[PDB]
Design an enzyme around this catalytic site. Structure first.
Site, PDB file in Angstrom:
ATOM      1  N   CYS A  75     -10.277 -10.550   6.147  1.00 57.16           N
ATOM      2  CA  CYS A  75     -10.998 -11.142   5.259  1.00 57.16           C
ATOM      3  C   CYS A  75     -10.332 -12.506   6.009  1.00 57.16           C
ATOM      4  O   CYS A  75     -11.036 -13.342   6.258  1.00 57.16           O
ATOM      5  CB  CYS A  75     -10.231 -11.109   4.036  1.00 57.16           C
ATOM      6  SG  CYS A  75     -11.067 -10.277   2.611  1.00 57.16           S
ATOM      7  N   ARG A  87     -13.366 -15.699   5.836  1.00 56.52           N
ATOM      8  CA  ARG A  87     -14.608 -15.499   5.636  1.00 56.52           C
ATOM      9  C   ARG A  87     -15.043 -15.641   3.933  1.00 56.52           C
ATOM     10  O   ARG A  87     -16.234 -15.619   3.757  1.00 56.52           O
ATOM     11  CB  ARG A  87     -15.400 -14.631   6.247  1.00 56.52           C
ATOM     12  CG  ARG A  87     -14.668 -12.708   6.561  1.00 56.52           C
ATOM     13  CD  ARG A  87     -15.436 -11.539   6.718  1.00 56.52           C
ATOM     14  NE  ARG A  87     -14.674 -10.607   6.093  1.00 56.52           N
ATOM     15  CZ  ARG A  87     -15.130 -10.228   4.687  1.00 56.52           C
ATOM     16  NH1 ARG A  87     -16.156 -10.280   4.448  1.00 56.52           N
ATOM     17  NH2 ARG A  87     -14.492  -8.543   4.400  1.00 56.52           N
ATOM     18  N   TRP A  90      -1.051  -1.894   0.117  1.00 58.35           N
ATOM     19  CA  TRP A  90      -2.238  -1.395   1.094  1.00 58.35           C
ATOM     20  C   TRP A  90      -2.653   0.330   0.405  1.00 58.35           C
ATOM     21  O   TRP A  90      -3.150   1.232   1.051  1.00 58.35           O
ATOM     22  CB  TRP A  90      -1.808  -1.064   2.186  1.00 58.35           C
ATOM     23  CG  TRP A  90      -1.537  -2.631   2.594  1.00 58.35           C
ATOM     24  CD1 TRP A  90      -1.054  -3.581   2.908  1.00 58.35           C
ATOM     25  CD2 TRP A  90      -2.895  -3.629   3.367  1.00 58.35           C
ATOM     26  NE1 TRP A  90      -0.874  -5.089   3.374  1.00 58.35           N
ATOM     27  CE2 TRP A  90      -2.590  -4.635   3.704  1.00 58.35           C
ATOM     28  CE3 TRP A  90      -3.726  -2.856   3.714  1.00 58.35           C
ATOM     29  CZ2 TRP A  90      -3.548  -5.395   3.894  1.00 58.35           C
ATOM     30  CZ3 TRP A  90      -5.501  -3.726   4.330  1.00 58.35           C
ATOM     31  CH2 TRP A  90      -5.267  -5.194   4.538  1.00 58.35           C
ATOM     32  N   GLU A 115       5.173  -8.202   3.530  1.00 58.67           N
ATOM     33  CA  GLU A 115       4.017  -7.340   4.323  1.00 58.67           C
ATOM     34  C   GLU A 115       3.663  -8.393   5.672  1.00 58.67           C
ATOM     35  O   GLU A 115       2.938  -7.346   6.832  1.00 58.67           O
ATOM     36  CB  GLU A 115       2.650  -7.577   3.552  1.00 58.67           C
ATOM     37  CG  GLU A 115       1.594  -7.519   4.078  1.00 58.67           C
ATOM     38  CD  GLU A 115      -0.003  -8.429   3.115  1.00 58.67           C
ATOM     39  OE1 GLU A 115      -0.967  -7.791   3.109  1.00 58.67           O
ATOM     40  OE2 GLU A 115       0.097  -9.181   3.131  1.00 58.67           O
ATOM     41  N   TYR A 174      -4.210  -5.464  10.382  1.00 59.22           N
ATOM     42  CA  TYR A 174      -4.050  -6.956  11.710  1.00 59.22           C
ATOM     43  C   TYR A 174      -2.569  -6.920  12.212  1.00 59.22           C
ATOM     44  O   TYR A 174      -3.088  -6.871  12.918  1.00 59.22           O
ATOM     45  CB  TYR A 174      -3.282  -7.699  10.023  1.00 59.22           C
ATOM     46  CG  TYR A 174      -4.934  -8.115   9.332  1.00 59.22           C
ATOM     47  CD1 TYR A 174      -5.521  -9.126   9.852  1.00 59.22           C
ATOM     48  CD2 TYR A 174      -4.692  -8.445   7.624  1.00 59.22           C
ATOM     49  CE1 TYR A 174      -6.451  -9.653   8.693  1.00 59.22           C
ATOM     50  CE2 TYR A 174      -5.723  -8.099   6.915  1.00 59.22           C
ATOM     51  CZ  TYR A 174      -6.544  -9.510   7.758  1.00 59.22           C
ATOM     52  OH  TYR A 174      -7.798  -9.989   7.095  1.00 59.22           O
ATOM     53  N   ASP A 184     -11.277 -14.468  -3.096  1.00 64.13           N
ATOM     54  CA  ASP A 184     -10.251 -14.471  -4.070  1.00 64.13           C
ATOM     55  C   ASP A 184      -9.654 -14.931  -5.165  1.00 64.13           C
ATOM     56  O   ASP A 184      -8.599 -15.423  -4.220  1.00 64.13           O
ATOM     57  CB  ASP A 184     -10.350 -12.470  -4.589  1.00 64.13           C
ATOM     58  CG  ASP A 184      -9.891 -13.112  -6.350  1.00 64.13           C
ATOM     59  OD1 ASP A 184      -9.705 -13.413  -6.597  1.00 64.13           O
ATOM     60  OD2 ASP A 184     -10.352 -11.408  -6.142  1.00 64.13           O
TER      61      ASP A 184
HETATM   62  O1  LIG Z   1      -6.078 -11.333   1.177  1.00 61.22           O
HETATM   63  C1  LIG Z   1      -6.638 -11.526   0.542  1.00 61.22           C
HETATM   64  C2  LIG Z   1      -7.912 -10.077   0.720  1.00 61.22           C
HETATM   65  C3  LIG Z   1      -9.365 -10.010   0.558  1.00 61.22           C
HETATM   66  N1  LIG Z   1      -9.769 -11.273  -0.629  1.00 61.22           N
HETATM   67  C4  LIG Z   1     -10.965 -10.124  -1.110  1.00 61.22           C
HETATM   68  C5  LIG Z   1     -12.081 -11.337  -1.553  1.00 61.22           C
HETATM   69  C6  LIG Z   1     -13.294 -10.326  -1.993  1.00 61.22           C
HETATM   70  O2  LIG Z   1     -13.491 -10.260  -3.394  1.00 61.22           O
HETATM   71  C7  LIG Z   1     -12.667  -9.335  -1.023  1.00 61.22           C
HETATM   72  C8  LIG Z   1     -13.869  -9.089   0.561  1.00 61.22           C
HETATM   73  O3  LIG Z   1     -14.997  -8.395   0.125  1.00 61.22           O
HETATM   74  P1  LIG Z   1     -15.877  -8.033   1.450  1.00 61.22           P
HETATM   75  O4  LIG Z   1     -16.128  -9.012   0.825  1.00 61.22           O
HETATM   76  O5  LIG Z   1     -15.714  -7.295   2.046  1.00 61.22           O
HETATM   77  O6  LIG Z   1     -17.803  -8.247   0.646  1.00 61.22           O
HETATM   78  O7  LIG Z   1     -11.289  -9.109  -0.242  1.00 61.22           O
HETATM   79  C9  LIG Z   1      -9.159 -12.091  -1.117  1.00 61.22           C
HETATM   80  O8  LIG Z   1      -8.891 -13.555  -1.236  1.00 61.22           O
HETATM   81  N2  LIG Z   1      -8.079 -12.212  -0.262  1.00 61.22           N
END
Ligand SMILES: O=c1ccn([C@H]2C[C@H](O)[C@@H](COP(=O)(O)O)O2)c(=O)[nH]1
Ligand SMILES: O=c1ccn([C@H]2C[C@H](O)[C@@H](COP(=O)(O)O)O2)c(=O)[nH]1
Lengths: 316, 316
Positions: A198, A218, A82, A60, A146, A221
């Site tokens: 994110c 921002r 994706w 990726e 990205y 998970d």
């Molecule tokens: O590489 C990644 C991509 C996504 N998320 C997750 C965390 C959130 O559950 C989700 C974003 O939802 P919103 O934060 O945009 O509301 O993306 C990660 O932790 N790592």
């Protein structure tokens, strides 16, 4: 051990996050504002306390690095990270004649019948992207991701800027720059995106001939996402270092909202009862230096010996 | 005490930063990647260990908040923070007939004659901005500055977006959003700016009816700059909280490069030998809620009782 800050973030959210029932019907524990470093000279941070698939992560990052926004390159490496977002597009188009597939997010995780006409349409979708060029061009291409944010950011004067390659050339000519910043965040797109990025921006820094990178993520998970995010940026930090003739310094991971879906409590706890192993080692092809033209075979992991993978339901 | 993380950052750079001789002929000590919180319910973080001018900081935040980019509003509050960048513009224009004022940055800090024909042209410059509307419009207006970045970000479709007011309305309608982000960083402007913004982006977060904010500051002058930066964002955090009917939570300060010019070592050390006092208290006008139409008189500091100011040469 190298990965401990990861286990300290988990523990920290376990006994300090608050319940915040956001974006869904599930719930999370949540903290705001956290930061952790990894000294990349001590080994590569691919979590040993659970099996993380490196192939997915490298295939990726290369995609991002070629500036590509079309899924087809991914499917050609059996990388499905994706598919969802592409296929979703397909599903609401006029050329779509099939089972209505509304809200297959949840719907394919309750209904176990549905969830089989779902790997139906998908396998079918992926295949057409692999073989039919025009379909690939029409629905295989994400647009705002990205790869084009980093390397093809649209100006208003209607050109296209390659932030990442400009920055790299700044690192060679002016390593002491406090301005080495790549941002994935465009406020004119941000409100009409299915996923406002994110990984919001990152900053390089050099000192004593060592390269560091700091990532502002921002939203995170902690269980499924962050393990990947970490190896992704620590890899970028190695590539850039390698291309600029530099040594490697630290990867610094800064978070805004870091969360744990409640459906993951047991799984994270099991993990917290394992004892880290000595970290693996990265190896780049010493002959090739132009990192935009790197291939899978040019990046090697050594001595990765994880504990087993931990299956866990995805977030609904 | 409330301000201690500030004194811990100073100490930390004092005995751990590396010498990095960047942008100048001076030198700095430098660390990369730091983070500190302030619990805003414990009092307002205006450093008590040295006199910081609150009036300057509030009159500038209001400027940003009205979306204004013209110095005249500042000069009308005896706020000179931004004169340099405006006047510089003046100085390279065709309508300019005067002493050549090349590199008055340094030149007015060596030559002590020069540095008097310098507060000559400036006092003269400021005055014309105050009185001559068209001159004000021509040279009083900075263009790319926080006020228009926050509230009037130019789209490519040629409109103008008010990120800050959109975000605030998102906080009222969707406080659990992980997407509450304002960015000051446009990559199509960034390479032709005399000052690509130091305060790169910020993120709000709400939980238990409390508002927090986290700032990613790319580059930071620990001695002169950071004292101001802190009160500026902790104030923003109070205004927004007040407008959204919310309580106040923490201000989180995240840094990329944080530095100390070497010309400031003695001054910072003196400061580190003082003992913090109990922090002052903020008071907002309880009747007025629309924070874009706030005035100086609507914001009060209580019980600020600092140690004396510490003069120190600015960075050359
Ligand atoms: O590489 C990644 C991509 C996504 N998320 C997750 C965390 C959130 O559950 C989700 C974003 O939802 P919103 O934060 O945009 O509301 O993306 C990660 O932790 N790592
Ligand atoms: O509110 C501010 C504004 C500026 N700086 C300083 C730190 C650096 O000395 C300078 C930026 O120079 P470059 O970082 O852009 O190279 O701005 C601060 O600390 N705080």
């Amino acid at each position: 051990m190298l990965e401990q800050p990861y286990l300290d973030l988990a523990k920290k959210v376990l006994d300090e996050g608050h319940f915040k029932p956001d974006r869904t019907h599930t719930g999370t524990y949540s903290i705001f504002g956290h930061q952790m470093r990894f000294d990349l000279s001590k080994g590569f941070p691919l979590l040993t306390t659970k099996k993380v698939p490196f192939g997915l992560i490298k295939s990726e990052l290369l995609w991002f690095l070629h500036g590509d926004t079309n899924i087809r390159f991914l499917l050609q490496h059996r990388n499905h990270i994706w598919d969802e977002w592409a296929f979703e597009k397909w599903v609401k188009s006029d050329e779509y004649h099939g089972p209505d597939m509304t809200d297959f997010g949840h719907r394919s995780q309750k209904d176990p019948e549905f969830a089989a006409v779902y790997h139906e349409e998908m396998a079918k979708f992926d295949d057409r992207v692999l073989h039919d060029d025009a379909f690939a061009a029409k629905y295989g291409d994400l647009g705002l991701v990205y790869g084009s944010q980093w390397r093809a950011w649209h100006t208003s004067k209607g050109d296209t800027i390659d932030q990442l390659g400009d920055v790299i050339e700044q690192i060679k000519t002016h390593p002491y720059s406090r301005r080495l910043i790549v941002s994935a965040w465009n406020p004119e797109d941000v409100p009409t995106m299915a996923l406002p990025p994110c990984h919001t921006l990152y900053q390089f820094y050099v000192n004593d001939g060592k390269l560091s990178l700091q990532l502002y993520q921002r939203s995170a998970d902690i269980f499924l996402g962050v393990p990947f995010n970490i190896a992704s940026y620590a890899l970028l930090t190695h590539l850039v270092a390698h291309e600029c003739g530099l040594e490697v310094g630290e990867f610094i991971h800064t978070f805004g909202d870091a969360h744990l879906w409640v459906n993951h409590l047991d799984q994270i706890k099991e993990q917290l009862s394992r004892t880290p192993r000595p970290a693996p080692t990265l190896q780049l092809n010493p002959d090739k230096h132009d990192i935009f033209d790197f291939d899978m075979k040019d990046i090697k992991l050594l001595n990765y010996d994880p504990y087993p993978a931990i299956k866990a339901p995805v977030a609904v």
